[PDB]
């Protein structure tokens, strides 16, 4: 969120 | 000349797979001729691949000094720094590579990946386009650009883009090269199930290749529960024990396991982030092991094996922070995929995928490399009953009866209502209604003035938009709010006299067919709006342009910023209906909307990711919300927005069933997971290889 | 229309200085008409200025929803997010502002500041140029671009650029507007001392304006040492108690204070970074107060006053993490500027500047708003004797005698040399020399092969390029290395048969006149190289181009990457001479080079920042290294590079004097600082206002 | 330094 953080499921680096 | 031959020999032994002999030979070439840029660059690449990043960095520094026009060494050094989490350093290296050689397509693509990972999608798009202008045949840049375009809902030449992605994947699989489409993104594109499984398998093979160099023998596994005193040792492996959707779904599960039959080990892949989610799992698991302090996959797998794990649970799959090399080493006799990854691992080292009959019907077993292990209702779970108990009940303020215009929620809401003189109880549990009097005026005045909080009869009445200013831990879901919170349509610019269709997922889940379906619904329901999120804000003008092209004025779509966790779940109460994305459903997001009591319309597809929402609805007991095709999806959504008595019935069903059904029942879920674990164990103990656990 | 008049009244009361009445009136305008974008945007700006960032953010979110074409609100919301340390969020906002209005010069400039602060100077330069293309008269963008250009050594139209900066500052000071040149950058440009002091004063005035809104009365100060049992209470205020040059200079000072006469309070403005520098100051100060946990400047100044501080020490000035508002509140009767800031605060709330006769001669008192408080030798100090005691002695390997080709250092170096059969002692203390035999071959083989370490007679022999792989705390200077380290010219590509002139500062300190002086030296000394750092790497091609234009081939300048702390100090032993930057000297960097025993040539200017190196050399006792003009600077540097017997004499003088002189003597320094403190106190106690303490 | 950090004296935001 603006002013903080919203963690999400995301891809690992490749 | 002798140094040249030594470098050639090292390259030969490198191709054979003998990495240690290659290192020894590169060092001998440097011993003979120390100012050898190519030998330094080759040794650095070899060390980087071994995970010896600091050592690789020494050799890249040598190559760049010796050959100042060596743009390739700057680019490769940038890749090593990126892996070391030195983002500024990596950017500096790619910047220098582009300055040395402006025609170096790879360096532009690597620079674009820094902009992408830093959230600057328009700059990522610009740098990928430069890479493709320079090198038209560039699978990594094309596929990474396609994902940037997906994130911002840029659908220019979409059908042709989708055909090219499929063509690129087909060629890479045929030529035995690692596909440029990430397995976690494969469900977003119209690839075959065979192709999606093959991409996953290639990623699984990378893990096996990385562990084969350790030359570790196969582990001796337990054959009974005697050494564990009749208890099944279950190991949960996750990089997400902390502030992350994974913990927001399963944080209560470890502590709900039966200690008489189970011994729980949680293997954290991430350091402690200081949040209550990490505190809870550390306090409630029988054992908590911080593997982030053990970077070697060999030593970390030895640790898992030493603990005597019977069932090792992969909660990452191909997601950020994963260490699938741990599973490739097979430290446990049974290894299962669970909850965190919505697809197949495609890997032989994973035995099972924990799913259900709705998500993964037996007919589609071919889409998975793993055997299917069914939970009885849905494999999906959420910690909403523990994290947001203040949303179990609600009261409304009648400002003219509506259940979603002005809403109150709080642990002490009953006591507050008891202090009020003219409260009406509308039978559904039941919904208390406060009339448009002095107390109702004070509430609306607070919202209009942007005031943080007020006091009514000694009770704390908080503005729902100001939770971070009142209690930041309550805003993130780390603590239950201790005040009464007000949520209103006016806080988000939503119309007081219209139907609100919502979708709170990241915009990448929307495709042209989905937006067209939504436009068709809006056109059929005059008094209606579509409520979306700036996720990211750069996607907003693209959605608005395509909606305008579909014949919808700007005022039919309302955007809100992404909100802190508690506010996001709470504001779902303002919508009438959630319109789920058929391409890739809301997963955590679907649980969030249903906890607010919001009916969700879905059209299940074929992939696991496109079927989760229908599995959640089937468990909930709302079969009427599941569409078989696009026309039925539109018809269900239009019926809900026009037949107000039907809408009331369905919203009432969702409101009651989120409690009475198994959906948010973490204790029942843990008990069913335990039943499934014992089935997996008894099958293995009897000397059988994994098979589908489908009854 | 009533809401319009209410917003107008709030704007009036805002201009008057009545911020609380302005807030109340903006809220009343919103009470009347809630969908008022201008009232939300004005209230947000007012709250942002009050430091109420979260509250300001609520109102910016309202403005952007109400008016989707309100690019100004997106840009201003971006500024609030940047202040909240949400860099990605801020970038998203500036990106949206530019998409809404591509002609919005301010948004491009704000986007350029994100690229600048994130270290991406070429992108910062590109965005500032777009801002200036759109708005030619834009002081903030022009001055910020001039600083980007300074960082990368881009000297295109330098003289005209310098004239324009002076013209911009002159106009801003005349029109009572905050100058666009930051006071910390003012010494880099040819501004008058009057202008540099006036810029500083305007920054000091911002702090006073921010504290006047708290409406706090003047504090009652102690008039004696009775309540402190005859002890002087000294408060050190710094955001740099941790891994930062400030702690690398003064970390031993708090613990060296005499407890019978002094009570030390360290006020940290930064959270604990987990480093040994923070551990040391927390363990050794009599009191350690974490003000990073007290964001309110009123409450933090109340805390300082409650402690009964007699002398409050400003270690930041206009540097990152400063809270000069604490000093503007005057919680102590005596407030002094010390060590961290190389210039005047220009502020009436600062009483003294701790300096010396060499750095700040009485003649130039006019350059400072503060009264001069002289330390007897230099105000400069370094913790080198405590952090790098392994560099107090050295041994060399004779590979053909040179003191700086192949160097050994270590706590156990004497014991290692005693285990060797044919060690020669060259009288200078003394320098042991190891001959070119078996042990000498094993050392060079390690370096050439890039090997991390070897063992000789049971002693640990480490490759100086691999310190982070051996002991990361020793690499950063947090721990003293426990192995014997090898440092060689071949590790950096330096010539074995030539004079090495070095400069390890950030490239921004170099200007065209300086590079020309250096080119003149190199041309006069055939067997010579200039050794510089990639600080940043993007400055390397600009320096190389200007050097080529001056007639120097690429091979006359050798670049190395920035190194971890210990390696940076240790590798200074490889140079013959350091060529100091006259524009702005090396300060911490000068102490680093002198600890290696490297003579430094300097030309002191008029500003404090341009005179530090000559003050360090005067204390050291090397007057012959101080140049009165450019010709003398070149003549001294050329004599050192050509008269080898003279070079030997000078290097020997530096080697001995870094120990025998007061330069690195932290105990003597603390005792002299204590003498100065008592002079300041006795002057105030006798009822006198501050005056120069110059004897 | 590349692969780590080198803290420096820098200007405060304005
Ligand atoms: O305004 C919002 C919208 C979403 N979320 C959270 O953002 C995350 C999104 O994660 P992801 O995209 O992985 O959701 P999923 O695909 O599982 O629905 C979830 O924890 C949501 O609860 C949030 O806190 N605020
Ligand atoms: O290769 C290098 C070059 C410099 N430094 C350190 O970088 C900092 C530079 O700080 P600053 O520019 O403020 O130095 P100053 O202007 O005081 O010389 C100092 O702590 C140096 O010791 C370092 O660790 N490695």
Provide an overview of this structure.
Chain A is low in regular secondary structure and 14 residues long. Chain A has no helices and no strands. Chain A is elongated. Chain B is of the alpha/beta class and 695 residues long. Chain B has five domains: 1-104, Tetratricopeptide repeat domain (Serine Threonine Protein Phosphatase 5, Tetratricopeptide repeat); 105-215, Serine Threonine Protein Phosphatase 5, Tetratricopeptide repeat, CATH 1.25.40; 216-382 and 659-695, Rossmann fold, CATH 3.40.50; 383-497, Signal recognition particle alu RNA binding heterodimer, srp9/1 (2-Layer Sandwich), CATH 3.30.720; 498-658, Rossmann fold, CATH 3.40.50. In chain B, 46% of the residues lie in helices and 12% in strands. Chain B is built from 29 helices and 19 strands. A seven-stranded parallel sheet of chain B has the order 3-2-1-4-5-6-7, covered by helices on one side. A seven-stranded mixed sheet of chain B has the order 10-11-8-9-14-13-12. In chain B, a hairpin with an 8-residue loop joins β8 and β9. In chain B, α5 (71-83) packs antiparallel against α6, α6 packs antiparallel against α7 and α7 (105-117) packs parallel to α9 (139-151). The radius of gyration of chain B is 28 Å and the shape is globular. The chains are: A little secondary structure (14), B alpha/beta (695). Chains in contact: A-B, A-C, B-C, B-D, C-D. Chains B and C meet through α2, α4, α6, α19 and β17 of B and α2, α4, α6, α19 and β17 of C.
């Amino acid at each position: 969120y603006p002013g903080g953080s919203t963690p999400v499921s995301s891809a690992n680096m490749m | 000349t002798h140094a040249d031959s030594l470098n050639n020999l090292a390259n030969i032994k490198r191709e054979q797979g003998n990495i240690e002999e290659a290192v020894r030979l590169y060092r001998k070439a440097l011993e003979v001729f120390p100012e050898f840029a190519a030998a330094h660059s080759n040794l650095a690449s070899v060390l980087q691949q071994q995970g010896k990043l600091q050592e690789a960095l020494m050799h890249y520094k040598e190559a760049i000094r010796i050959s100042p026009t060596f743009a390739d060494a700057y680019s490769n050094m940038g890749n090593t720094l990126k892996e070391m989490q030195d983002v500024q350093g990596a950017l500096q290296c790619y910047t220098r590579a582009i300055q040395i050689n402006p025609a170096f397509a790879d360096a532009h693509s690597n620079l674009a990946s820094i902009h992408k990972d830093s959230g600057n999608i328009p700059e990522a798009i610009a740098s990928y386009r430069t890479a493709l202008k320079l090198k038209p045949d560039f699978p990594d840049a094309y596929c990474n650009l396609a994902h940037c375009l997906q994130i911002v809902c840029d659908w220019t030449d979409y059908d042709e883009r989708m055909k090219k992605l499929v063509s690129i994947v087909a060629d890479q699989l045929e030529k035995n090269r690692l596909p440029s489409v990430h397995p976690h993104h494969s469900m977003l594109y119209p690839l075959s199930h065979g192709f999606r499984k093959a991409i996953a398998e290639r990623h699984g093979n990378l893990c096996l290749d990385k562990i084969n160099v350790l030359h570790k023998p196969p582990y001796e596994h337990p054959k009974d529960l005697k050494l564990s005193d009749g208890r099944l040792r279950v190991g949960y492996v996750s990089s997400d024990f902390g502030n992350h959707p994974t913990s927001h779904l399963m944080q209560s599960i470890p502590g709900m396991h039966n200690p008489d039959k189970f011994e729980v080990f949680c293997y954290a892949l991430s350091p402690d982030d200081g949040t209550n989610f990490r505190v809870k799992v550390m306090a409630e698991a029988n054992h908590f092991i911080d593997l982030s302090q053990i970077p070697c996959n060999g030593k970390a797998a030895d640790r898992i094996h030493q603990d005597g794990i019977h069932i090792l649970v992969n909660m990452n799959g191909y997601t950020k922070g994963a260490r699938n090399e741990l599973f490739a080493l097979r430290p446990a006799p049974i290894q299962a995929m669970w909850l965190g990854y919505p697809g197949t691992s495609g890997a032989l080292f994973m035995d099972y995928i924990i799913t259900d009959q709705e998500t993964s019907p037996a007919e589609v077993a071919e889409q998975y490399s793993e055997k299917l292990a069914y939970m009885p209702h849905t494999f999906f779970i959420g910690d909403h009953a523990n994290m947001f108990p203040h949303l179990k009940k609600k009261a409304v303020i009648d400002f003219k009866i509506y259940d979603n215009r002005i809403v109150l929620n709080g642990i002490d809401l009953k006591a507050f209502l008891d202090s009020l003189p003219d409260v009406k109880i509308v039978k559904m549990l039941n919904m208390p209604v406060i009339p448009m009097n002095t107390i109702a005026e004070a509430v609306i005045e607070m919202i209009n003035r942007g005031q943080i909080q007020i006091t009514i009869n000694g009770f704390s009445i908080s503005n729902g938009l100001a939770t971070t200013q009142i209690n930041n831990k309550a805003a993130t879901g780390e603590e239950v709010p201790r005040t009464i919170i007000v949520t209103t349509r006016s806080q988000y610019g939503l119309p007081e006299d219209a139907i609100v269709y919502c979708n709170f997922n990241q915009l990448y889940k929307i495709d042209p067919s989905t937006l067209q379906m939504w436009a068709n619904i809006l056109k059929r329901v005059p008094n209606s709006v579509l409520w979306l999120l700036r996720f990211p804000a750069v996607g907003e003008p693209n959605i608005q342009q395509y909606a305008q092209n579909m014949g919808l004025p700007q005022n039919r779509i309302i955007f809100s910023p992404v909100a802190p966790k508690e506010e996001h779940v709470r504001r779902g109460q303002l919508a009438d209906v959630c319109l789920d994305t058929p391409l890739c459903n809301g997963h955590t997001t679907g649980m969030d909307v249903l906890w607010a009591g919001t009916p969700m319309v879905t059209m299940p597809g074929e992939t696991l990711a496109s079927r989760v929402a229908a599995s959640q609805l089937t468990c909930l007991g709302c079969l009427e919300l599941i569409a078989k095709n696009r026309q039925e999806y539109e018809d269900i959504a239009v019926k809900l927005g026009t037949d107000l008595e039907y809408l009331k019935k369905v919203r009432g069903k969702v409101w009651k069933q989120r409690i009475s059904s198994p959906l948010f029942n973490t204790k029942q879920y843990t008990m069913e997971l335990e039943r499934l674990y014992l089935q997996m164990w008894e099958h293995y103990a009897a000397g059988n290889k994994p098979d589908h656990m489908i009854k």
